[PDB]
Design an enzyme around this catalytic site. Sequence first.
Site, PDB file in Angstrom:
ATOM      1  N   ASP A 111       0.829  -1.195   0.000  1.00 38.04           N
ATOM      2  CA  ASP A 111       0.000   0.000   0.000  1.00 38.04           C
ATOM      3  C   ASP A 111       0.871   1.255   0.000  1.00 38.04           C
ATOM      4  O   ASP A 111       2.089   1.203   0.195  1.00 38.04           O
ATOM      5  CB  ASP A 111      -0.933   0.002   1.212  1.00 38.04           C
ATOM      6  CG  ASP A 111      -2.178   0.841   0.993  1.00 38.04           C
ATOM      7  OD1 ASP A 111      -2.245   1.552  -0.030  1.00 38.04           O
ATOM      8  OD2 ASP A 111      -3.088   0.789   1.847  1.00 38.04           O
TER       9      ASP A 111
HETATM   10  C1  LIG Z   1       1.683  13.472  17.872  1.00 41.38           C
HETATM   11  C2  LIG Z   1       1.039  13.919  16.561  1.00 41.38           C
HETATM   12  C3  LIG Z   1      -0.469  13.680  16.549  1.00 41.38           C
HETATM   13  C4  LIG Z   1      -1.045  13.700  15.136  1.00 41.38           C
HETATM   14  C5  LIG Z   1      -2.527  13.333  15.108  1.00 41.38           C
HETATM   15  C6  LIG Z   1      -2.992  12.900  13.721  1.00 41.38           C
HETATM   16  C7  LIG Z   1      -4.339  12.182  13.757  1.00 41.38           C
HETATM   17  C8  LIG Z   1      -4.555  11.301  12.528  1.00 41.38           C
HETATM   18  C9  LIG Z   1      -6.008  10.862  12.371  1.00 41.38           C
HETATM   19  C10 LIG Z   1      -6.322  10.422  10.943  1.00 41.38           C
HETATM   20  C11 LIG Z   1      -7.822  10.360  10.669  1.00 41.38           C
HETATM   21  C12 LIG Z   1      -8.134   9.827   9.271  1.00 41.38           C
HETATM   22  O1  LIG Z   1      -8.190   8.659   9.079  1.00 41.38           O
HETATM   23  S1  LIG Z   1      -8.420  10.981   7.898  1.00 41.38           S
HETATM   24  C13 LIG Z   1      -8.990  10.045   6.450  1.00 41.38           C
HETATM   25  C14 LIG Z   1      -8.900  10.917   5.200  1.00 41.38           C
HETATM   26  N1  LIG Z   1      -9.745  10.388   4.143  1.00 41.38           N
HETATM   27  C15 LIG Z   1      -9.310   9.230   3.382  1.00 41.38           C
HETATM   28  O2  LIG Z   1      -8.269   8.720   3.623  1.00 41.38           O
HETATM   29  C16 LIG Z   1     -10.186   8.666   2.265  1.00 41.38           C
HETATM   30  C17 LIG Z   1      -9.472   7.902   1.155  1.00 41.38           C
HETATM   31  N2  LIG Z   1      -8.101   7.655   1.561  1.00 41.38           N
HETATM   32  C18 LIG Z   1      -7.034   7.582   0.580  1.00 41.38           C
HETATM   33  O3  LIG Z   1      -7.274   7.729  -0.572  1.00 41.38           O
HETATM   34  C19 LIG Z   1      -5.599   7.327   1.039  1.00 41.38           C
HETATM   35  O4  LIG Z   1      -4.717   7.670   0.007  1.00 41.38           O
HETATM   36  C20 LIG Z   1      -5.383   5.863   1.437  1.00 41.38           C
HETATM   37  C21 LIG Z   1      -6.414   4.958   0.766  1.00 41.38           C
HETATM   38  C22 LIG Z   1      -5.507   5.729   2.953  1.00 41.38           C
HETATM   39  C23 LIG Z   1      -3.986   5.427   1.002  1.00 41.38           C
HETATM   40  O5  LIG Z   1      -3.895   5.609  -0.382  1.00 41.38           O
HETATM   41  P1  LIG Z   1      -2.636   4.931  -1.203  1.00 41.38           P
HETATM   42  O6  LIG Z   1      -3.104   3.659  -1.868  1.00 41.38           O
HETATM   43  O7  LIG Z   1      -2.153   5.895  -2.259  1.00 41.38           O
HETATM   44  O8  LIG Z   1      -1.505   4.621  -0.251  1.00 41.38           O
END
Ligand SMILES: CCCCCCCCCCCC(=O)SCCNC(=O)CCNC(=O)[C@H](O)C(C)(C)COP(=O)(O)O
Lengths: 70, 52, 88, 84, 63, 459, 242, 124, 128, 175, 61, 178
Positions: free
Chosen positions: C43
Amino acid sequence: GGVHIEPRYRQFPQLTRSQLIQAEFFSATMWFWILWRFWHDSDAVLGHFPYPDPSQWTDEELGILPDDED
Amino acid sequence: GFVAFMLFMFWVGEIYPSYQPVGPKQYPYNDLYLERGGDPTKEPEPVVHYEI
Amino acid sequence: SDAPPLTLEAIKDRVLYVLKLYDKIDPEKLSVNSHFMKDLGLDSLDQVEIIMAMEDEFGFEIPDIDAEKLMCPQEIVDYIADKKDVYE
Amino acid sequence: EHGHSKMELPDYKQWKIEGTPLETVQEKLAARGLRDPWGRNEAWRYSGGFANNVSFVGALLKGFKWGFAAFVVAVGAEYYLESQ
Amino acid sequence: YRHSIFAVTHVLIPVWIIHYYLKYHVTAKPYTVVERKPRIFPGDTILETGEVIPLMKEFPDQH
Amino acid sequence: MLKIIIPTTMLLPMTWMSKHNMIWINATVHSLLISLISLSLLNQLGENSLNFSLTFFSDSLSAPLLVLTTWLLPLMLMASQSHLSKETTTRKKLYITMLILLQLFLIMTFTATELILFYILFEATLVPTLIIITRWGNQTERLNAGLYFLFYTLAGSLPLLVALVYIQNTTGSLNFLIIHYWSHPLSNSWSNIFMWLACIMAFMVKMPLYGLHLWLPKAHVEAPIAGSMVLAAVLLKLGGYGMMRITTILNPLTNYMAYPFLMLSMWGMIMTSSICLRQTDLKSLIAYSSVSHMALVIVAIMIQTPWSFMGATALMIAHGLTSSMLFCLANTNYERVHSRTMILARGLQTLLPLMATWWLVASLTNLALPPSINLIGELFIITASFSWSNITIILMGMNMMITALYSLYMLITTQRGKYTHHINNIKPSFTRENALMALHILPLLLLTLNPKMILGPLY
Amino acid sequence: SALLHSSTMVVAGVFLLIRFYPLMETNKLVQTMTLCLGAITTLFTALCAITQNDIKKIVAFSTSSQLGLMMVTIGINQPHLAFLHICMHAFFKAMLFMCSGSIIHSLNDEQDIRKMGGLYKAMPFTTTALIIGSLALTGMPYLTGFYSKDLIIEAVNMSYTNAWALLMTLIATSLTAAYSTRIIFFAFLGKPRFPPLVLINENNPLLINSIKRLLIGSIFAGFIISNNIPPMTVPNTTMPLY
Amino acid sequence: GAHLARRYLGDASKEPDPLRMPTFPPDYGFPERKEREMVATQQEMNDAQLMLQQRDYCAHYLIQLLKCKRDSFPNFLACKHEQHDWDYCEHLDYVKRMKEFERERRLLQRKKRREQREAEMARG
Amino acid sequence: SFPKYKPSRLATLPATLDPAEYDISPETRKAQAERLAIRSRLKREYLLQYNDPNRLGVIEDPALIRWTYARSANIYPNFRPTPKTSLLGALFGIGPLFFWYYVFKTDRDKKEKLIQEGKLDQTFNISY
Amino acid sequence: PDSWDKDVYPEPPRRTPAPAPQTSLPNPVTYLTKIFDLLVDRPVTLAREFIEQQHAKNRYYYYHREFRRVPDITECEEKDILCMFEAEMQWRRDYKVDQEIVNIIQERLKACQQREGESYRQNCAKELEQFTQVSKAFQDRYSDLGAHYSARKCLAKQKQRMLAERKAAKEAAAA
Amino acid sequence: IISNWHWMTLQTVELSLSFKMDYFSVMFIPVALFVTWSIMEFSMWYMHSDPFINRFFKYLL
Amino acid sequence: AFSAPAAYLTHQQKVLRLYKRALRHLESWCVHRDKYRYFACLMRARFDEHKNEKDMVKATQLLRQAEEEFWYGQHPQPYIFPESPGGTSYERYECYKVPEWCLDDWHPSEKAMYPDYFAKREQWKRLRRESWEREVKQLQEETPPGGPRTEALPPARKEGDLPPLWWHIVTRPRERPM
Ligand SMILES: CCCCCCCCCCCC(=O)SCCNC(=O)CCNC(=O)[C@H](O)C(C)(C)COP(=O)(O)O
Ligand SMILES: CCCCCCCCCCCCCCCCC[C@@H](O)O[C@H](CO[C@H](O)CCCCCCCCCCCCCCC)COP(=O)(O)OCC[N+](C)(C)C
Ligand SMILES: CCCCCCCC/C=C\CCCCCCCC(=O)O[C@H](COC(=O)CCCCCCC/C=C/CCCCCCCC)COP(=O)(O)OCCN
């Protein structure tokens, strides 16, 4: 000015007996110095002279009359 | 807030100092009159210190 | 410094070492030109984790715009060689 | 004169999670349903001479034994010399 | 040999020049070099005069 | 005194009769010899002065200025020899003639036993400078600059002449010696106030004062390298010399009338030092630094104490040398770059290390680093001002801080960092430029060994 | 950083106040200002130090805290004791910075403590030198830091000062111990965290000799100097046991 | 500390101000009132030029300490007894200062008690 | 929820916290494409002028000349006497002068009065 | 040294203690100064003798310039320029001499302070009093003349001070 | 006190090259020299790869 | 660095950048390796809960509250590699980087040393000179009308051609010139 030592890549690096013996000797010397000073000169930390108690002084050497003379 | 608290508490400590349960240091010769300023032709008031 | 002059052979050896320690990949199926998304079935998040492994292994961080388009180990070794100006 | 000795990398199968806190990490992760994919990458930090650790107090008395032995020898010598 | 020549081209010659300049030029003018008038203690004697500083008042010595 | 004037006059025939390819060599050699001759004037007395004749006299205030004026001409020729390469022989000889005429006028001005002769030469120095600025200038604004540099000066100087002749009608003599020996107090009157203003503003305009400093950035930017050198080094000191010579008769009215100019200078030093911080031009920044230093000199002269005068003389000499060096370095950068902008060419220390060392030394000596004579003058003026009033120290310290800030800003912006990539015509510095920098800087570090030579008559 | 900004140049201002001590003792307001400034400086710098990740920053903040302690000592009318503190601090802080530089060079110019792990056995001479230096800095009896800092604390406690300045001096001592143990723990005790290519090496006589000379200094110089110089102040011969 | 707490949290008039100590005359307690004894005269104590603050009643032991330090130079641990003697005299001086502080303190306490008793007698 | 970050003049809003970025639209995409086209054209021109082996001089930057000219020479011709400008000029050019004049005048009258009464103790004051 | 007169720059008899070695250990100081003498003092002394003989081979003298006394500004006419010039030059010479006198007194004070060490406050009261007197006189003479100072301005200041003194004395006598 | 060279004299103020050798100077000089010696010995190895090492040592001196 | 930028960042690029920043800052928070591994796997699991999500509005609502949470806990003093734009050795060796054209101003006595180097340099200059006219033409014929749209340069398409605008990319001084 030293000897040739190669990198190791994820293992403990090569150690020379000279640096180890020098470090151990210096640490042992410092501990011996501390212990020798403590034995010969102990009063530098614990004190040599007792601290007097102001309440233990009797009322005569202090110069108090029993509340009626003056 | 940190600066103001530091200044205010420094002033408070100036208002309330810290010391030992002792009297002032005693000095032998007229509180060292001759060796502090001099003026030997004035005859300062004689101060006598306490034996205790 | 006293740092040895690393060569592309050493760089590729270390890259393949890091990739073999990746338990998600069978070591006997990996190759120098093996693609990440298709040949190895990885991935995108696994690709960025591989990028992190390379950064923590080589002591420098690859800019994200360049990291996100590195698809095979061969390109990674090539990019690192260009970064460090490796002769042979 | 530089370090050109053609250093060879070890075998990648040498690094095992076994005997490391990475085992405890993996057990805690599996109780939830997860596995770490980079565990064997960092096994070398617990494998060789890095396995045995020391405490901060133990670090402080790095050379306490030799110093204490020298102190007792010197004290005995001084006691036997002055008592004369 | 390196240290032998170094100690005479970097130490001995500067000491010679500075000592000559201090003893024969700087000290020629008044107040250029001023001392501390070393401490005088009871029981000491002065080379210039030969007189002996009288001792102290014999305080009671105990512990 | 003619032993200096006559060789300077003979410099003209020599230049004109000189071969078409030997003008620079002869001019430089004979100018250096004339400077060596003028070096003899430094031997002053604790008594009155060196009165050579009825027309010319020397003093330990005039002697360092005369030595600096004689020394500047070879440096000016060496700096000007570069950009006049594609120029016809007649016009190069005309340029050298203008420089020689300016030096002769300055030399006669600094002796000037009589005040009307001093005014005549002090205003005669204007014509060669105007010709140099408006003829051998690069930009189209030079003409405007010339106009400014002219009219400002006259706007201050025409009343002075009237005052001068008026004094000769009342006192009966404009000779400096008789004026000093027969000085009488000025009654606090409106007429005396206006005579004070007429005597003062002529020299205040050329320093320049903070309010009247507009002409200086224009004149310094649009003038050639020799014009900038002569303006920054010597021409600014004419006002200070005139003020120190003329303030003898202005007492005791000086105490009341010094307040507006003292306030203007004490605030304009801060204003110009802050202006230096945000500047996209090297020459403009050096000009504003000159304005700040001359404002400090004005404060010193208005305070009117012995330490004030000593610090003022030392500061004028040091500032002249330092500003000439800074302008020379900026011109050396410009001749390669042709843009005259600080941010355009960067990281020159990587390409020109010795020139970077020269830049560092120039910035340090402009920063008033002890025991340089810049620091000696600044410290003497600061102490005199503190004696005058203890609150001036705030403004003086602020000025020192901003001065150090903008000096190191100028050094770092041009010498440190990464070089400009597209610039590839940066050739190694020539022997001429390095020799110019060395001949500018060595006298400063030699004069710091003998400060009393430049401390003036009140030492 | 080891020569100018830790041991020699940065004490210069303190030295200035030492030079004018005959005029310092005759004024009370300026002494109070000096004491308050020193106390607030040492407290603030130690508090900033106890949470840094760059080792050089931690050492610099420790130096600034020691300078604040020196200023407090000047403020409490003990210029000679402040000079003694300067003399000892130069020794042990210079050696500490030299150890930091050796570790920095060994780890391929890495300064953050998050990438420095097991070095107690990986590099032993630097380990023992840093341990001795930290012990001297925090103050171990009969070490070079004791003969200065212990007397500093006793003079502060046994004289007419402000309560707040004394409190901040004590808290600054505690925070000095805190950042010393932070450095030791985060740089020498845990598992290694540096990149896999190990380039750790100490076999060079120049570094070893330079470190060991200052080691002998940081062990013996305090005792030698204290027992050699003449007495310049009245001692606090009697003291509460606590 | 305890005196600091007693003064800043209790009654201010109960304990003295160290700036103005002593407040009461010296011979208030007993009429004997022996004077302090000095061993060091003016001339030799000026010649030793110890320090202005070091010119106290413990000067003779300090002078002998300086004698030992100057005489036995290479053996900088030779004269340890004289350091002990000077420390002992400094201890005695500080103990007498503490006795003086306690003396004025209970003098003030007795004065306050006598004033309260007189006020009670007047009220009754 | 977490405490909100408040932007300021010297602490601007983070790039990833701007509400405008997440409001994607065809017009915004077209604007960004045109911006990148302009940047690409300028970069292509600069590189064409830069890699030329025949060029042996600086590459004139019209942006730099425009910046310098607008900073220095374009100020006065666009100046207009406005209550804002008039008031600000009067303040910053007159107020400090009169303020410092008052301060120094008060100090010097105090010192002169103290000298006249003779209670200043000017002993050892020789150099001035 | 005969190069300067001891009376203008007085010095105490400079008594020094005699060495009293209480122990048998050889102090490094004595041996260090002996080797310093042998290695430094003898060659420098020999070179000085060589140079002094060379100077003795060629001897010549210079004389201190003497100046006559001239009527001061108080005996000069209002517009007579020659006597005013002479008086101004004489006054400037006297001003320089007074500056040198104050310099000498300050040198005495500095030397006394450095020499007496810890007891400088008491053992140099005489030098402080001398400097106070000479500085008071110098300030009374030339405090407020300022730049462009002259004999006429000094005389005017003296006249003002003497008028004030006469008025004060008259008021006190008739008080 | 070693006042060896006489600089400019300004009326009653005299400026001279004067060095003070009290306890402070004679005690601080050896410590500073010892620390500086150790620092340059360390910089020998630490600045081994710096092209301008002589300039670095000149700056330190 | 080398790759030309795009007109905008897609959603997947943004989420990958947030993942990188969050993992780096978590590693900064978690000093020890095992703790970092556990919490990084936990964060990866938290991230892959919404991988299969399809609604674009809900996807934009996602990663946004995530960026806010990241900003709240962003470890105000994160780890930076020494040569990175925030590291302690970011531009240490930029003072030793000297341009190649400086060698053209060397004195002949200096060029007497290293003759083979200057011979190879002469061949390089000729190759650049012959090559340059062709490169300009390729750029002129390959560039779309109306100016370039993206600052990406085309490769060489013929045999003897070279990549357009190659001289100053091939002739970088070094990463550590001295
Ligand atoms: C200490 C620091 C703290 C930081 C806190 C951060 C908190 C993080 C929380 C995250 C919440 C979420 O999930 S936010 C979710 C955002 N929305 C999506 O991910 C929808 C579709 N996702 C994609 O298309 C991506 O590319 C994917 C398929 C994953 C990979 O693709 P690849 O095939 O190209 O690898
Ligand atoms: C623009 C950039 C700078 C250029 C140069 C500026 C500096 C020149 C300013 C000249 C100084 C002020 C001129 C007169 C000062 C005299 C003192 C006066 O201000 O104080 C009061 C004077 O009172 C009033 O000021 C009366 C004068 C009012 C008229 C002047 C106009 C005020 C503002 C105009 C400023 C414009 C100046 C520039 C013109 C081009 C004292 O009252 P009084 O005791 O009774 O008079 C004493 C004088 N006597 C004895 C001769 C009679
Ligand atoms: C850079 C531009 C600076 C301009 C400088 C202008 C300031 C100088 C003052 C204005 C010019 C005055 C010249 C006067 C020359 C001195 C002669 C003198 O003072 O004699 C007075 C004459 O005084 C005057 O007549 C002066 C009147 C002024 C007329 C011209 C006005 C010019 C503008 C005045 C306003 C500006 C004031 C400040 C200007 C500062 C510059 C910014 C005595 O006259 P009597 O009749 O002989 O006396 C007999 C009875 N006792």
